[PDB]
Design a protein around this ligand. Structure first.
Ligand SMILES: Nc1ccn([C@H]2C[C@H](O)[C@@H](COP(=O)(O)OP(=O)(O)OP(=O)(O)O)O2)c(=O)n1
Ligand SMILES: [Ca+2]
Ligand SMILES: [Ca+2]
Length: 424
DNA sequence: ATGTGACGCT
DNA sequence: AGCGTCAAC
């Protein structure tokens, strides 16, 4: 029951939006800086932070004005605003630059604007057949950390010794050795990271392991500009002090009630329990999933899908700004449907496909829920006016208000989303 | 007053 | 289908 069949990697760009602005504006390079959204309210909402600024305590979600109190020198780049809304086109375009390069090595699954998983298994099998049965130089792994090593004098010093203990203990003439494969994946990943920095100027970190979750957790262990190998063997130690919240899926309510119901804190504590025990507690899927996972075993595959499955535009209208006339509602529906049209037209022309379903969603004041009503709609032509008129229609009936020019509760949110794509 | 996109459940 | 969860996009 190995869980060592695959070789999987998660690459994720270091402070991505910041790096995109720093490439464009050299003055921002090597400085405490952040990317900000909407400068009016409290200086703007910060959404990405360079590591220099992080050392001052500046975080995401922090108000730029508040960030400047921790960090007086903090430089700010501003998100482009089209049609009264934050537009992300520059980062989406920077994303496909990375995603394309990365595709040259293996098939990837776009996990976000910023990161992608890679199944390296096949590419690893092939590279061994040139290295018959030649070793692996530390020189081939210049930015790789081996989690748990060394065991048994300053930062880069220690990385080095861990790598050497790992390479020395390595069974090279055996080509089905899981640990050897991970090492081969790591060398490949060194290369794809060098290709990314060369051809884009962006730096990233990577995690190399046997499945998606380990890969991902491995990736954050040595950030930035570094990659980390997490082998099957290293899992009991890593997990034994690993807060459960840190594993992907378990950072919300399910994870919070793993802790609750079981009276544990770390992932390794899950091993005590039988698969049936966990199934009774969390469901059949969640029981099986946790039983394997706490032993470093996970089987979610790397889906072959480089591009998003939905395209969507939303805007919030908090408190005072909530929409209360219907001319107001119609105007933003149009703005949204406009950004959407252009994103969609680009998509049919770039990625050879058409969306067929339009999802409209809203929020009303006095409702803490993330939404308040989603309705679907046909999407027969990529016309902004039609879509905004159709979106209205599917929500026109959402009017508590008697007087026919005002809007019921004022609306806290509008969301338009293209979906159900088909080949063109 | 922080402001995309995937998938699970029923 | 419409709602919820998750992480982070
Ligand atoms: N809540 C969030 C999270 C992220 N992003 C955007 C800004 C980020 O730069 C990018 C990638 O998100 P990450 O969570 O990977 O964080 P960074 O890449 O900014 O930094 P790190 O080096 O910690 O990954 O997506 C955002 O707008 N809102
Ligand atoms: Ca990142
Ligand atoms: Ca990321």
């Amino acid at each position: 029951a190995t869980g060592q069949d695959r070789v999987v990697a998660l690459v994720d760009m270091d402070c991505f939006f910041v790096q995109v602005e720093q490439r464009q504006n050299p003055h921002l390079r090597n400085k405490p800086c952040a990317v900000v959204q909407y400068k009016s309210w409290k200086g703007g909402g910060i959404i990405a932070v360079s590591y220099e600024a992080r050392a001052f305590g500046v975080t995401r979600s922090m108000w730029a004005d508040d960030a400047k109190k921790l960090c007086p020198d903090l430089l700010l780049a501003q998100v482009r605003e089209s049609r009264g809304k934050a537009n992300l086109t520059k980062y989406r375009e920077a994303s496909v630059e990375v995603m394309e390069i990365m595709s040259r090595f293996a098939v990837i699954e776009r996990a976000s604007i910023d990161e992608a998983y890679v199944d390296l298994t096949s590419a690893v099998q092939e590279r061994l057949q040139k290295l018959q049965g030649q070793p692996i130089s530390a020189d081939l792994l210049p930015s790789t950390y081996i989690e748990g090593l060394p065991q048994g004098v300053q930062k880069e010093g220690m990385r080095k010794q861990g790598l050497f203990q790992w390479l020395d203990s390595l069974q090279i003439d055996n080509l089905t050795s899981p640990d050897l494969q991970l090492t081969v994946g790591a060398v490949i990943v060194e290369e794809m990271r060098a290709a990314i920095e060369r051809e884009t100027g962006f730096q990233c970190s990577a995690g190399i392991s046997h499945n998606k979750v380990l890969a991902k957790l491995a990736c954050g262990l040595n950030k930035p500009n570094r990659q980390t190998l997490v082998s099957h063997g290293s899992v009991p130690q890593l997990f034994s002090q690993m807060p459960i919240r840190k594993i992907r899926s378990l950072g919300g309510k399910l994870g919070a009630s793993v802790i609750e119901i079981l009276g544990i804190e770390y992932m390794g504590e899950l091993t005590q329990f039988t698969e049936s025990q966990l199934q009774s507690h969390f469901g059949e899927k969640n029981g099986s999933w946790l039983y394997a996972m706490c032993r470093g075993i996970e089987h979610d595959p790397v889906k072959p899908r480089q591009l998003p499955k939905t395209i969507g535009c939303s805007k919030n209208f908090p408190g005072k700004t909530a929409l209360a006339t219907r001319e107001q509602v119609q105007w933003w529906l149009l703005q949204l449907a406009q950004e959407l049209e252009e994103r969609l037209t680009k998509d049919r022309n770039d990625n050879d496909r058409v969306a067929t379903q339009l999802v409209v969603s809203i929020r009303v004041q006095g409702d803490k829920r993330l939404s308040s009503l989603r309705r679907c709609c046909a999407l027969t032509r990529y016309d902004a006016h039609k879509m905004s008129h159709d979106a209205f229609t599917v929500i026109k009936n959402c009017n508590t208000s008697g007087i026919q020019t005002e809007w019921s509760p004022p609306l806290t949110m509008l969301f338009l989303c293209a979906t159900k794509f088909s080949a063109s």
